């Protein structure tokens, strides 16, 4: 199967449902955690705990097709280099949500 169908199932996003949209980041964990001290931006929800990466990162966007339904989830895979926007929280101050990519 395609990377999205494979990884969505492996990572427990589609073993118990079909999730419409999910992004995977092909960078080290430490380089993603480093975004929490990068550019502070507003989140889509109005909160102010979001951060945009200075650099573009290698990402794969996974999005369900129009006819996809559980258990046969089906995804469209789109690969791109984009800046990421994450919401951060806690001690240590780390990513807790993937807000968007630009």
């Amino acid at each position: 199967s395609n990377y999205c169908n494979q990884m969505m199932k492996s990572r427990n996003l589609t073993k118990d449902r079909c999730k419409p949209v999910n992004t995977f980041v092909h960078e080290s964990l430490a380089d993603v955690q480093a975004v929490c001290s990068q550019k502070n931006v507003a989140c889509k929800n109005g909160q102010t705990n979001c951060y945009q990466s200075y650099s573009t990162m290698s990402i794969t966007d996974c999005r369900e097709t129009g006819s996809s339904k559980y258990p046969n989830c089906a995804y469209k895979t789109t690969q791109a280099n984009k800046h990421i926007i994450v919401a951060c929280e806690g001690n240590p101050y780390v990513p807790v949500h993937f807000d968007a990519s630009v």
Partner: peptide
């Protein structure tokens, strides 16, 4: 319970 930080890694990281 899975923490919010662990959830983000499982769902989004693929180094």
């Amino acid at each position: 319970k899975e923490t919010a930080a662990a959830c983000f890694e499982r769902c989004h990281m693929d180094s």
